């Protein structure tokens, strides 16, 4: 399927809630990777998923300091699931136009 369609299939709320808990100071982290596992391919279409996690939470990001902290968590999320981090995630541009 197209990258936009694969992301729409899975429920990214555990991923968004896991990142937001760390930013703002049952197992969301396991469920996030469990929901990210229900994809045709993780090495690919992962950047669109990572961007969509930030897109669904932009209204709760107040300034660029919060956005920068959110980006750091997103780029570390693949390592949290024992995945491979993609090498072309353009989160900076997408985080400034949401």
């Amino acid at each position, epitope marked *: 399927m197209s990258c936009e369609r694969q992301v729409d299939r899975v429920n990214l709320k555990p991923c968004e809630q896991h990142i937001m808990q760390r930013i703002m100071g049952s197992d969301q982290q396991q469920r996030c990777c469990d929901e990210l596992n229900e994809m045709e391919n993780t090495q690919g279409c992962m950047c669109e998923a990572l961007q969509q996690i930030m897109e669904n939470q*932009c209204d709760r990001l*107040q300034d660029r*300091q*919060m956005v920068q902290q959110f980006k750091r968590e997103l780029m570390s999320l693949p390592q949290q699931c024992n995945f491979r981090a993609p090498q072309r995630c353009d989160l900076d541009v997408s985080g*400034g*136009r949401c």
Partner: antibody
Amino acid sequence: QVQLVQSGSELRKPGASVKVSCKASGYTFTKYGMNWVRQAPGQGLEWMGWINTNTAKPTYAQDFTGRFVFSLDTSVNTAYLEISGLKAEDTAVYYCATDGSEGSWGQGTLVTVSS
Amino acid sequence: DIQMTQSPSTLSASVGDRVTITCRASQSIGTWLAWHQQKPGTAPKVLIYKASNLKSGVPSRFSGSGSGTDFTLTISSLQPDDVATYYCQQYNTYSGTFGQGTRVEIKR
């Protein structure tokens, strides 16, 4: 009640330095970064850059590189703006500001540079 | 580099008139825009954040809308104490620059 209280007016001679303080209260200081805005007399607002209140890393717009340095003291919830090599054209009102739902403006600090 | 073009540089209107100030960005900034009000001699006050959210204490006749590149600030019924200069401001990751400003005066 979010409040940004800045230091008072300053008069400086050319080539000297000034240090403007901005004390924050009513919110978590490290939650949001601090912006700095300059307003020359009768002109608009120029964004100077911002400082990450969590990591202390400053970011400057090009026109305010070199002689302008952002710093902070988290234990007191204060951000600092220090200008060196003052010129007459540096005479302006300097504001600290935050963005977002809790964003606010400091009352501003008038820095006058004159012989 | 993102350019902030505030359309009315100056504006004259009557009391009770609808007043619209437009900010247009050279490229999308996506809701990362704020509206400020400054009266001479006094510090600016934030009117709108996230391009549509009213700040506390702002009269309800003030209104913001738009996303992407096009944003407008609207005063539903202009009052004599609305005489000020209005600034849009992007606050995305890259930049925090302001618009050139809109001076509002009352026609009487």
